Design a protein around this ligand. Structure first.
Ligand SMILES: [Mg+2]
Ligand SMILES: [Mg+2]
Ligand SMILES: [Mg+2]
Length: 131
RNA sequence: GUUCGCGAAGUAACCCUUCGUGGACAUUUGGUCAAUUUGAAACAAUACAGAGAUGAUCAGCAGUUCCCCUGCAUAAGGAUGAACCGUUUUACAAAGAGAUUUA
């Protein structure tokens, strides 16, 4: 299969042309955006992955699992701060959904960092969310 | 080059000519751009074939696209214009049962 950089290169170009064709015809079919992001991670190239998600959000922001996976895409590379900024834009974009708040929480508990989860629940309570 | 005027010389008798000088008249074009190979036409020819819905042979309208072509066109054609026909795993839990480890 692959020999050197140049063969990997053509194996990328071919995929990108193909997929972004299939995204070019359907702006929808979110699973396609997901899968294509996943490929983009397996190429160990993040920057493109970040973009590809961002665009995937500008298509639809009300589909959470793309939020989530665009978190875990930042964490599984063991880079946190992006998985923070993403969370500020997330809960601020969707206060009414729970899974964002809970996930940002757990991210701050497995880091043990309390000052956050204090101030955090201070907000997430202060909005009269529910029981 | 014209004209007004002055001075000088000559002709002269207030002029005809020549020289010098003052003044006025007339007053800023064009370039996005160099002259054939190396700052960009597109077809044709060769080879490979040789027309969507079906079991098969055809009429067709659409729909999406960071594809357009012909047409004056908001008409209508261009294979129903072409491309589409593919790759596909996580909001994830609850109850029960066996093996392993530990307070
Ligand atoms: Mg037509
Ligand atoms: Mg036909
Ligand atoms: Mg058509």
């Amino acid at each position: 299969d692959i020999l050197d950089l140049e063969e990997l290169r053509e194996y990328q170009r071919r995929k990108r042309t193909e997929y972004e064709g299939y995204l070019k015809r359907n702006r929808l079919d979110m699973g396609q955006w997901i899968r294509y992001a996943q490929f983009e991670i397996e190429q160990h190239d993040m920057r493109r992955a970040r973009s590809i998600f961002e665009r995937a959000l500008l298509v639809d922001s009300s589909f959470i699992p793309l939020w989530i996976r665009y978190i875990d895409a930042e964490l599984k590379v063991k880079c946190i701060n992006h998985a923070r900024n993403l969370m500020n834009r997330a809960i601020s974009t969707l206060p009414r959904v729970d899974k964002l708040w809970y996930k940002y929480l757990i991210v701050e508990e497995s880091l043990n960092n309390v000052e956050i989860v204090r101030s955090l629940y201070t907000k997430w309570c202060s909005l009269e969310p529910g029981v």
